[PDB]
């Protein structure tokens, strides 16, 4: 069970962007599997993702 309230509503990170679903709707919604892809890039390459 993952808590997305401290990950989003706390506003402890720099920025976030959502696609197709609101960030406040992720508490009552979920799918079959969840993955996390960790990588390091530059600032000018953020828009390329």
């Amino acid at each position: 069970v993952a808590d997305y309230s401290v990950l989003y509503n706390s506003a402890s990170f720099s920025t976030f962007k959502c696609y197709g679903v609101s960030p406040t709707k992720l508490n009552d919604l979920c799918f079959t599997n969840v993955y996390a892809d960790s990588f390091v890039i530059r600032g000018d390459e953020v828009r390329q993702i």
Binding site: T15, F16, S22, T24, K25
Partner: protein, 49 residues
């Protein structure tokens, strides 16, 4: 969402998503109004109907 046969003529800056940003753009909201990209030289998808 707007119900069938409902009119809103307001052109001002209001709430976009589920989190009100209180007027002026910022606080992880976006600018609601957008403009058409119609180009005479491109294909069918960009042609106005």
């Amino acid at each position: 969402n707007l119900k069938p046969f409902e009119r809103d003529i307001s052109t001002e800056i209001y709430q976009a998503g589920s989190t009100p940003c209180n007027g002026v753009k910022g606080f992880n909201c976006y600018f609601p109004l957008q403009s058409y990209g119609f180009q005479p030289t491109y294909g069918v998808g960009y042609q106005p109907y």
